Amino acid sequence: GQPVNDFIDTATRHVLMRQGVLGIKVKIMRDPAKSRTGPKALPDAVTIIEPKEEEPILAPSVKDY
Amino acid sequence: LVLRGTLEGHNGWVTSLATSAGQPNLLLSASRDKTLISWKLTGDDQKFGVPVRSFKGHSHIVQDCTLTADGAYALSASWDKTLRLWDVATGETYQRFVGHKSDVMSVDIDKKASMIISGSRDKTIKVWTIKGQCLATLLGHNDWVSQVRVVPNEKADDDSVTIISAGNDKMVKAWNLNQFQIEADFIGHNSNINTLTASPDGTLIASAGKDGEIMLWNLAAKKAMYTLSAQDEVFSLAFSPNRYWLAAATATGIKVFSLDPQYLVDDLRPEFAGYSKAAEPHAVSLAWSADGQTLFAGYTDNVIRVWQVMTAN
Amino acid sequence: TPVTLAKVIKVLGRTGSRGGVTQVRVEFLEDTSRTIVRNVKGPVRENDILVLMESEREARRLR
Amino acid sequence: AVPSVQTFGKKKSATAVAHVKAGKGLIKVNGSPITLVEPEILRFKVYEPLLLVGLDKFSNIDIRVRVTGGGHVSQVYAIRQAIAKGLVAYHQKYVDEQSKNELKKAFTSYDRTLLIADSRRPEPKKFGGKGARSRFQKSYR
Amino acid sequence: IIKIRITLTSTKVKQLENVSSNIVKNAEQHNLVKKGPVRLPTKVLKISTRKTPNGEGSKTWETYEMRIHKRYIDLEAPVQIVKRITQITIEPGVDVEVVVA
Amino acid sequence: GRVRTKTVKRASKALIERYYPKLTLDFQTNKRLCDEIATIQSKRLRNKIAGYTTHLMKRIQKGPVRG
Amino acid sequence: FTPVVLATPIPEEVQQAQTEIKLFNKWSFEEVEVKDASLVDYVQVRQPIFVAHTAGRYANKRFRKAQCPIIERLTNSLMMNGRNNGKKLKAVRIIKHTLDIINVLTDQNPIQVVVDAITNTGPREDTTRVGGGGAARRQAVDVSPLRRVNQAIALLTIGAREAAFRNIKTIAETLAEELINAAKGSSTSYAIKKKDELERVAKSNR
Amino acid sequence: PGVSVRDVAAQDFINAYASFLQRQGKLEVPGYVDIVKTSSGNEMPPQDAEGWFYKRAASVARHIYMRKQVGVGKLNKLYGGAKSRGVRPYKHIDASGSINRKVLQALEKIGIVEISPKGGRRISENGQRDLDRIAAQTLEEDE
RNA sequence: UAAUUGCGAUAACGAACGAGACCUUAACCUACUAAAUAGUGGUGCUAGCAUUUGCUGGUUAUCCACUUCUUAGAGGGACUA
RNA sequence: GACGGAGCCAGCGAGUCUAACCUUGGCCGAGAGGUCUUGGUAAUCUUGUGAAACUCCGUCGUGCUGGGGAUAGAGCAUUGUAAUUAUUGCUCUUCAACGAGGAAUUCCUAGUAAGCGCAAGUCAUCAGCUUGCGUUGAUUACGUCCCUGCCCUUUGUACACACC
């Protein structure tokens, strides 16, 4: 998808040899975690927090300040 | 208290409900079809209320609403991050209130009707004016401010107001709005807390949520009385202005209880044809009348059914 | 002339080499107990009616 | 304050504006009456909402509709949709809810959606064929 | 006291919206009337070019695109504020022009 | 064919596995709940997550899951 | 008759002929009868129309072309042969003139003659292709009621064009004449001649 | 009770004002009313070779009444036609600028249409007036 | 299921690309921001008529609103509820 | 259906600096055009792109007819240093093969096929082409593995340059 445009960058070079030309197509896929311009994740990983429990009975009564 | 008719004109879940304390015969019901509709009451045994007007335009669900007692100003809290102030005549847009960065959840007016209270899903409790400027901006809740309610305090119109508010971060906080601060805090709910109601006399709050446990806090000496086992999710709670009742629409039925002494009068079930048992249409919106003679209940399937007061035998 | 008018109980399946014929069961609209397999040409559905000049044949797969 | 209301109908490009004011009964498109816009074989299609609802309600509304876009057919569909929407928006805002809903249900029990914008839009032309989905014929040999 | 008109034409839309937000904040910081943003249409510069080189294969066309947005604001400013809002209001690529009458 | 894939099914099982007493059977409430507790990059992905979560809660009030 | 007149006139011919019952242009939609079984829920004459141009979605679900009103389907069928694709106002003017010719020829309601005509010319058993090793014979099949309506209207219009092509006969006249002869069949009409040939090949290939 | 031209039809008002114009007669019509084509998009001089100038003048008076202001080029673009390019496919070609010029000048020589500010030609007060007097005729076409 | 799409069955378990997710555009939104390079209304001033208040206009800046239709930002919506 | 008047309704687009882009408005030219200014570095003007199909009134009535306009002669303008082996537009005239296309064969399931025009690319002039856009707007299916193909499993092989 458009992650081609966002999170990977290509670099195509014709490199001149003693014999005929070779070519290098470097694809560097940077992290989405440090893509500080743009959305911080590939749209495939969901980040959840884990919550904190509470004890059941608790004696429902009144506090006062 | 057996069913006396059928009301229709909304298209989604009827979420909330109100009347006026001067004229009992006008209704304003807010429902999940992004539209707020008024009824007149005619007392016909099949068409009990007759549609008058509808105030429109909201980009999301109108969740809550309340009117003033002479039928002058209508307030609709809707999930498009606003609360809209109108007149019940000509539906003209008087005052929009925006400012909650997430969905507004509950609005009310006080007894002079110039201090407008809106609790919002940006964890906040906001007090604006009738003009549209903000008087009080309250932080303090960790999760959503789901329902807020002013309390009717003592007579003679003292220059001092008092409010209660639930929070599904497990608190029932009462706030004093003279210096814009907390006045009292009550704890003891186990699950998320949808609805809370204050009494006519300003000393009973009955609060419950997805637990089915209706807990009553007396703001007189700030004491905590008891808890009755409602055993399913109490969708809506109301205090009766004459019989001092707890009238509760719960996740299977409608339990109505007389407080003095401890006895439950009735366990209402409206009979349907077609919907099943794990596909029950449940009640969402409850309202007594201003005189306490009729009872309005709006359901998920667009409908409102009306109960009357009558003798035993 | 015996032009018989019948009611589809159930539709059965898409027969034909080319795949455009429908096998169907017909109740007879006059007796409940004469239900016939019939190959119909157009699109057929349930609850509807058919015309037959020979309502007696009851064939099988059109190959 | 001259209790008017502006509504709008929209066909595939024919977009009509509808001005409705509390008046004497004149219904006009492009300044002329609706009886003098001339596809003439959709004249009864624009005559539909008036003699549908029974004309003695139109006596206190003057409506003026202006359309931009489209062709003759879509412009007639735009004006019938727009004045029907303007009628039911008047009977929402300025008179009773059940009168609005009664005209609304009487429009739904016939409708070619009549107060609802149609979502039917033209698909793009895709390359390799002069139709939007058609293609140029091939030879094979 | 003069009365200017700045026109922001660019393609990086959020840089446009941010420089116009800077401008409307500086205009309300010493208010002029209000003169909020006036929004011209997206001029679409579309080129259709064959994908293929020298011609063997199925015929394919790519419509490369540029998306130009023009916006403009009237202002009732002094000349020193004009110099500041043409100099310290700058961004990459965003064409900024101030036309006076 | 509206068949939900592994990102929506796995993430909805995760948020119901660690967030049963926060959610409900309401599509609107659970959509706002995935707004609050979900770090996601799409409104349509969040809508599909919340829809399968309401589907899962509607069958979990009727019985458990093998997983 | 309870009249009302407004600022714009909106004449009394219209205000009388349409407000008590909703007609055609001016044709009887009342008292029409489909005299036959297997053809109800496949014609549509009970809910009328003003003129037979309509903006309907009749392809997104399967059987809604039967919910489409019938003389609209007549206009849609007559706007083909791709020199004539998309002149639907021309086609519906043709059926307006056609029902005019039906009322001046016959005393019957012209939409009743349309219902009678497709009910009478709609063939009852067709004959489809089998794989047929060798002689390649074809099995008789009872054609569906929706295809009765479809092939009825289709053969009406093919006879209209190929009897209307190279002659001073115009389209509404030829369509009216095929419609009356297919209504009360005389075995001189091309529609019912094709109907009888479909029945003959179905019987002899049964 | 009020008379305007938009309460009579387009065919019938154009023919009524053409009948008025060939009644009143003197327009300074050109001499080539039977020679010309009216457009390059036509392959035959017109059928009524008599009064097409009066129909054209009536229709352009109605058009200038209806509009704000218009010129000879946009009247050519209006009255252009579909051109049979032979075996080559059809296009849209403009109409006769000379005939449009002389009919617009003839209505200038009556003073029906005049020169307008920001150019082009706009309707006169008397042009509207005589158009509404024949609109009074056609709105009293009901015996 | 359109899908190596998932449920399930397991000497496999945990993964990767592809599909999907993503992006552009198209449809709706009286809901926030608005605009003489967009349109309306009212007061300008007046043209034609019938003059019974009216109708159709004309007016580049005569003013004030106004944002429904237009434009484009920020968002809503549908998830097979 | 051709023809002649009349009704009149679109949207994506392009548009000139130190030189020849779109051109509104007046003037003449039957037409093509040429002229005098005004407007645009473009939601400002070309533009309401007044486009065509369609619509109404009127002639024509089946004859390879006025349908079709091929070919071909004469002339007028425009672009270009240059047009003949026609650059294009226009006027007059010539009035062909074509009587619904054989065996095959192609595109298509909703604003979709099809009729209908416009913009844009090359461009001094040339669009029958193409890329887009809108206008009018369907009949018929909601299937199938039969034919032509595709994916998966099982099986057979003396095939692997892989059934050509």
Strand partners, H97: none
Q: Are E99 and E92 in contact (CB under 8 A)?
A: no
Q: Is B222 left (phi over 0), alpha (psi -120 to 50) or beta?
A: left
In chain E, positions 82-101 with C-beta closer than 7 Å to nucleic chain I are none
Residues with Cβ within 8 Å of residue A23, at least 6 apart in sequence: A12, A13, A14, A15
Of F12, B287, E74, C39, nearest in space to G126 by CA: C39
Distance CA(C36)–CA(C24), nearest Å, equals 8
Tokens of G12: 């009394």
> In this complex, which of C43, C54, C63 lies closest to G144 when CB atoms are compared?
C43
> In this complex, which of H7, H8, H10 lies closest to D38 when CB atoms are compared?
H10
Of B127, B119, B107, B120, nearest in space to B18 by CA: B107
Identity of the residue numbered G86: G
Assign residue B233 the CATH number of its domain: 2.130.10.10
Strand partners, B27: B19, B39
Distance CA(E37)–CA(E32), nearest Å, equals 13
The answer to whether F16 CB is within 7 Å of strand I is no
Q: Which residues of A touch F15 (CB under 8 A)?
A: 48
Note the strand I nucleotides within 7 A of protein beta carbons: 1-3, 5-8, 17, 19-23, 25-35, 37, 39-42, 47-52, 54-60, 68-81
Tokens of E9: 């034409």
Strand partners, A26: A11
List A residues 33-52 in contact with F (Cβ-Cβ < 8 A).
39, 41, 43-44, 46-51
- CA–CA distance from H108 to each of A3, G136, G202, H120 (Å)? 68, 81, 77, 12
Pick the residue from chain B with its C-alpha nearest to A64.
B184
Say yes or no for a CB contact (<8 Å) between A60 and B222.
Answer: no
Tokens of B46: 């099949």
Of G156, G132, G122, nearest in space to G42 by CA: G122
Q: Are H104 and H113 in contact (CB under 8 A)?
A: yes
Distance CA(H120)–CA(H71), nearest Å, equals 5
Q: Count Cβ–Cβ pairs < 8 Å, chain A vs chain F.
A: 29
Picking from D7, D85, D88, D93 by the largest number of B CB atoms within 10 A of its own CB, the best residue to mutate is D93
> What's the CA H17/C1' J51 distance, rounded, in angstroms?
28
Strand-strand pairing, D15-21 and D62-68: antiparallel
Of B258, B262, B255, nearest in space to B212 by CA: B255
What's the sign of the alpha-carbon dihedral B224, B228, B231, B233?
A: negative
Q: Are B7 and B309 in contact (CB under 8 A)?
A: no
Q: Parse chain H into domains and list their residue ranges.
A: 1-143
> What's the CA H84/C1' J90 distance, rounded, in angstroms?
14
Distance CA(D26)–CA(B111), nearest Å, equals 49
Pick the residue from chain D with its C-alpha nearest to H9.
D36
Residue whose structure tokens are 């399946």: C13
What's the sign of the alpha-carbon dihedral B209, F11, B122, B118?
A: negative
CA triple D1-D2-D8, angle to 5 deg: 115
Strand-strand pairing, C36-40 and A8-15: unpaired
Q: Are G34 and G44 in contact (CB under 8 A)?
A: no
> In this complex, which of D33, D41, D42 lies closest to G8 when CB atoms are compared?
D33
Strand-strand pairing, D27-29 and D62-68: parallel
Distance CA(B99)–CA(B133), nearest Å, equals 10
In chain C, the domains with their CATH numbers are: 1-63 (2.40.50.140)
> In this complex, which of D93, D94, D97 lies closest to B37 when CB atoms are compared?
D97
Strand partners, B118: B107, B126
Of B162, B80, B82, B155, nearest in space to B115 by CA: B162
Q: Which residues of B touch F61 (CB under 8 A)?
A: 278
Q: Determine the distance in angstroms separating the CA of D12 from the nearest CA of chain E, rounded to an integer.
A: 20
Distance CA(H19)–CA(H21), nearest Å, equals 5
Pick the residue from chain G with its C-alpha nearest to D27.
G8
What's the sign of the alpha-carbon dihedral E39, E41, E44, E45?
A: negative
Residue D31 is given by DSSP the state T
C-alpha A52: how far from its chain's center?
27
Tokens of G58: 């009749």
H-helix or E-strand spanning residue F38:
strand F38-39
In chain B, positions 89-108 with C-beta closer than 7 Å to nucleic chain I are 93, 96, 98
Q: Determine the distance in angstroms separating the CA of B8 from the nearest CA of chain D, rounded to an integer.
A: 11
Residues in chain H: 143
User: What single string gives the DSSP state of each residue in G73-122?
Assistant: HHHHHHS-SGGGSS-HHHHHHHHHHHHHHHHHH-SS-HHHHHHHHHHHHS
Residues in chain C: 63
Strand-strand pairing, D32-33 and D27-29: antiparallel
> What's the CA H16/C1' I51 distance, rounded, in angstroms?
25
Strand partners, C38: C24
Q: Are B145 and B125 in contact (CB under 8 A)?
A: yes
Q: Which chains neighbour E (Cβ–Cβ under 8 Å, 3 or more pairs)?
A: D
What's the sign of the alpha-carbon dihedral B192, B195, B201, B204?
A: negative
Q: Are E84 and E96 in contact (CB under 8 A)?
A: no
Q: Considering only CA atoms, give the Rg of chain E.
A: 19
Buried b vs exposed e over H133-142: b needs ≥16 C-beta within 10 Å? Answer: ebbebbbeee
Q: Which chains neighbour D (Cβ–Cβ under 8 Å, 3 or more pairs)?
A: B, E, G, H
Structural domain count, chain F? 1
> In this complex, which of B189, B190, B223 lies closest to A62 when CB atoms are compared?
B223
Tokens of F44: 């349509």
Distance CA(C26)–CA(C32), nearest Å, equals 10
The answer to whether B182 CB is within 7 Å of strand I is no
Q: What is the 3-state secondary structure (H, E, C) of chain B?
A: CCECCEECCCCCCEEEEEECCCCCCEEEEEECCCEEEEEEECCCCCECEEEEEEECCCCCCEEEEEECCCCCCEEEEECCCEEEEECCCCCCEEEEEECCCCCEEEEEECCCCCEEEEEECCCEEEEEECCCCEEEEECCCCCCCCCEEECCCCCCCCCCCEEEEEECCCEEEEEECCCCEEEEEEECCCCCCCEEEECCCCCEEEEECCCCEEEEEECCCCEEEEEEECCCCEEEEEECCCCCCEEEEECCCEEEEECCCCEEEEEECCCCCCCCCCCCCCEEEEEECCCCCEEEEEECCCCEEEEECCCCC
Residue E84 is given by DSSP the state H
Structural domain count, chain B? 1
Does a structural domain hold residue F66?
no
Tokens of F34: 């995935």
Residue whose structure tokens are 């390799």: D128
Q: Which nucleotide minimizes the distance between its C1' and the CA of H52?
A: J5
F28 half-sphere exposure, CB direction, 13 A CA radius: 14
Does a structural domain hold residue F55?
yes
> What's the CA G62/C1' I79 distance, rounded, in angstroms?
25
Residue H107 is given by DSSP the state H
Distance CA(H136)–CA(H143), nearest Å, equals 12
Residue whose structure tokens are 């004959």: G127
Assign residue F41 the CATH number of its domain: 1.10.60.20
Of E1, E19, E15, E2, nearest in space to E72 by CA: E19
The verdict on whether omega for the bond into residue B261 sits within 30 degrees of 0, i.e. cis, is yes
Does a structural domain hold residue E44?
yes
Dihedral angle computed from the Cα positions of residues F40, F43, F45 and F46, in that order, rounded to the nearest 10 degrees: 70
Distance CA(D46)–CA(G50), nearest Å, equals 10
Buried b vs exposed e over B68-99: b needs ≥16 C-beta within 10 Å? Answer: beebebbbbbbbbbbbbbbebeebeeebebeb
Highest CATH level, class, for D1-127: alpha beta
Of B16, B102, B72, nearest in space to B286 by CA: B16
B9 exposure class (CB count in 10 Å sphere: 0-12, 13-18, 19+): buried
**Helix axis angle, H52-66 to H97-110, nearest 10°:** 70
Q: Determine the distance in angstroms separating the CA of B225 from the nearest CA of chain A, rounded to an integer.
A: 8
Q: Are E40 and E71 in contact (CB under 8 A)?
A: yes
Does a structural domain hold residue E18?
yes
Q: Are H72 and H103 in contact (CB under 8 A)?
A: no
Tokens of G124: 């009852």
Of B273, B256, B274, nearest in space to B265 by CA: B256
Buried b vs exposed e over G76-92: b needs ≥16 C-beta within 10 Å? Answer: bbbbeeeeeeeebbebb
Pick the residue from chain B with its C-alpha nearest to D96.
B52
> What's the CA C37/C1' J73 distance, rounded, in angstroms?
78
CA triple B32-B33-B37, angle to 5 deg: 95
Residue D137 is given by DSSP the state -
Picking from G2, G13, G50, G99 by the largest number of D CB atoms within 10 A of its own CB, the best residue to mutate is G50
> In this complex, which of A54, A58, A63 lies closest to B185 when CB atoms are compared?
A63
Chain A residues whose C-beta is within 8 A of a chain B C-beta are 54, 56, 58-65
Say yes or no for a CB contact (<8 Å) between E58 and D128.
Answer: yes
Identity of the residue numbered G56: G
Q: Are B147 and B105 in contact (CB under 8 A)?
A: yes
Residue D124 is given by DSSP the state P
Residues with Cβ within 8 Å of residue B271, at least 6 apart in sequence: none
Q: Are H112 and H127 in contact (CB under 8 A)?
A: yes
Of H52, H49, H74, nearest in space to H63 by CA: H74
Q: Which nucleotide minimizes the distance between its C1' and the CA of H85?
A: J69
Q: Are B168 and B178 in contact (CB under 8 A)?
A: no
D124 vs E: CB within 8 A: no
> What's the CA H48/C1' J58 distance, rounded, in angstroms?
9
In chain G, the domains with their CATH numbers are: 1-206 (1.10.455.10)
Residue whose structure tokens are 């309707």: H123
H-helix or E-strand spanning residue D88:
helix D72-93
Tokens of A40: 């911080």
> What's the CA D140/C1' J150 distance, rounded, in angstroms?
19
E11 exposure class (CB count in 10 Å sphere: 0-12, 13-18, 19+): middle
Residues in chain F: 67
* Range(s) of the domain holding residue F43: 6-61
Q: Are B191 and B185 in contact (CB under 8 A)?
A: no
Tokens of H77: 């673009």
Inspect the structure and tell me whether chains F and A have 3 or more CB pairs less than 8 Å apart.
yes
Tokens of G132: 């047929």
Distance CA(E24)–CA(E2), nearest Å, equals 18
D30 half-sphere exposure, CB direction, 13 A CA radius: 15
**Helix axis angle, G88-105 to G110-121, nearest 10°:** 100
Distance CA(D121)–CA(H141), nearest Å, equals 45
Distance CA(D89)–CA(D104), nearest Å, equals 10
Strand-strand pairing, D15-21 and H113-115: unpaired
- CA–CA distance from H143 to each of B213, B214, C20, F50, H134 (Å)? 86, 85, 66, 74, 15
Distance CA(C6)–CA(C34), nearest Å, equals 9
Tokens of B128: 């604006």
Q: Parse chain D into domains and list their residue ranges.
A: 1-127
Inspect the structure and tell me whether chains D and G have 3 or more CB pairs less than 8 Å apart.
yes
In chain B, positions 56-85 with C-beta closer than 7 Å to nucleic chain I are 56-60, 80, 82
Residues with Cβ within 8 Å of residue H135, at least 6 apart in sequence: H3, H4, H5, H7, H8, H13
Chain G residues whose C-beta is within 8 A of a chain C C-beta are 37-38, 41, 62-63, 124-126, 128-131, 139, 141-148, 150, 203, 206
User: What single string gives the DSSP state of each residue in E9-55?
Assistant: EES-HHHHHHHHHHHHHHHHHT-SS----EE---EEEEEEEES-SSS
Q: What is the 3-state secondary structure (H, E, C) of chain A?
A: CCHHHHCEEEEEEEECCCCCCEEEEEEEECCCCCCCCCCCCCCCCCEECCCCCCCCCCCCEEECC
Q: Which chains neighbour G (Cβ–Cβ under 8 Å, 3 or more pairs)?
A: C, D
Residue F19 is given by DSSP the state -
Distance CA(H122)–CA(D19), nearest Å, equals 28
The answer to whether D132 CB is within 7 Å of strand I is no
Q: What is the 3-state secondary structure (H, E, C) of C1-61?
A: CCCEEEEEEEEEEEECCCCCEEEEEEECCCCCCCCEEEEECCCCCCCCEEEECCCCCCCCC
Structural domain count, chain E? 1
Distance CA(E91)–CA(E15), nearest Å, equals 8
Q: Are G27 and G109 in contact (CB under 8 A)?
A: yes
> In this complex, which of B170, B187, B189 lies closest to A63 when CB atoms are compared?
B187
What's the sign of the alpha-carbon dihedral C16, C22, C24, C29?
A: negative
G137 exposure class (CB count in 10 Å sphere: 0-12, 13-18, 19+): exposed
Tokens of H79: 């009255």
Q: Which residues of D touch H7 (CB under 8 A)?
A: 32-33, 36
Q: Is E94 helix (H, G, I), strand (E, B) or coil?
A: coil
Q: Which residues of G touch D79 (CB under 8 A)?
A: none
Q: What is the 3-state secondary structure (H, E, C) of G113-165?
A: HHHHHHHHHCCCEEEECCCCCCCCCCEEEECCHHHHHHHHHHHHHHHHHHHHC
